[PDB]
């Protein structure tokens, strides 16, 4: 995250951090959708041009974390992965269409004040909320480096589809949307590399619930310069999510 503010304790209790085991390194964000299922971007797990092709035993997640560098005794939880499922039509060669993956935890995580699942959108919530100008939220650690670094938050407006299309060389698909402020400056917060895979959430005023509308897709460092971040459209991929969970 860049140009965010400090998240409050318990503010994003579905936030999941994905780590390489060896050597230990933060790879991506992710989200808790049940006590056993975690959502992330496919490119966090599989990106052949960079020799990236993780198996379950390569990885771990930490859940309930607020501070990047402080161990939070009795609060943060660690889990290993039973299985990774990448969308079979994930298009890593060209535009990262269907940039989505599911990870099953080896054992369920216990819910707490700090650990709690986010909702997947239903049709009416997606129809109501996925509109240009409406703001969603991304959370991650200060991809600016430093010392204390607690979870950061940025709230970003959904961008008009033609404006998105004109901002990039890539062929954008209906399975993606873009968010962020204009160059001429509404604000200047954004999701970064490292925030990739994390959730883009929106709060329904109708029922007071947080819904995961997007997954943070590809970013390099925090320089998009003139560009906008792209997000996997979770609702459009919801039947795939349900298929995987119901079968496995």
């Amino acid at each position: 995250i860049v140009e965010g503010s400090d998240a409050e304790i318990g503010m994003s209790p579905w936030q999941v951090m994905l780590f390489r085991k060896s050597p230990q390194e933060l790879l991506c964000g992710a989200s808790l959708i049940s006590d056993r299922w975690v959502l992330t971007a496919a490119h966090c797990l599989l990106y052949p041009p960079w020799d990236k092709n993780f198996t379950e035993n390569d990885l771990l997640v930490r859940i309930g974390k607020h501070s990047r560098t402080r161990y939070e005794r009795n609060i943060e939880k660690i889990s290993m992965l039973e299985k990774i499922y990448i969308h079979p039509r994930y298009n890593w060669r060209e535009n990262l269409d269907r940039d989505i993956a599911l990870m099953k935890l080896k054992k369920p995580v216990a819910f707490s004040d700090y650990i709690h699942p986010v909702c997947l959108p239903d049709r009416e919530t997606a129809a109501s909320l996925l509109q240009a100008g409406y703001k969603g939220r991304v959370t991650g650690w200060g991809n600016l480096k430093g010392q204390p670094s607690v979870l950061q938050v940025v709230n970003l407006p959904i961008v008009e589809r033609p404006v998105c299309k004109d901002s990039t060389r890539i062929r954008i698909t209906d399975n993606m949307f873009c968010a962020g402020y204009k160059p001429d400056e509404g604000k200047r917060g954004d999701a970064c590399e490292g925030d990739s895979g994390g959730p883009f959430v929106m709060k329904s005023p109708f029922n007071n619930r947080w819904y995961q509308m997007g997954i943070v897709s590809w970013g390099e460092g925090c320089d998009r310069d003139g560009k906008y971040g792209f997000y996997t459209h979770v609702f459009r991929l919801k039947k795939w999510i349900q298929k995987v969970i119901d079968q496995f």
Binding site: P13, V118, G133, Y134, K135, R137, R209
Partner: peptide, 28 residues
């Protein structure tokens, strides 16, 4: 699932976070 999206330290306690109003105000 039943309880999804309702945060123990916020919605469940009738407390709002510092910037959620920014989201709700954008939904015009």
């Amino acid at each position: 699932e039943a309880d999804c999206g309702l945060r123990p330290l916020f919605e469940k306690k009738s407390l709002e976070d510092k910037t959620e109003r920014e989201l709700l105000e954008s939904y015009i």
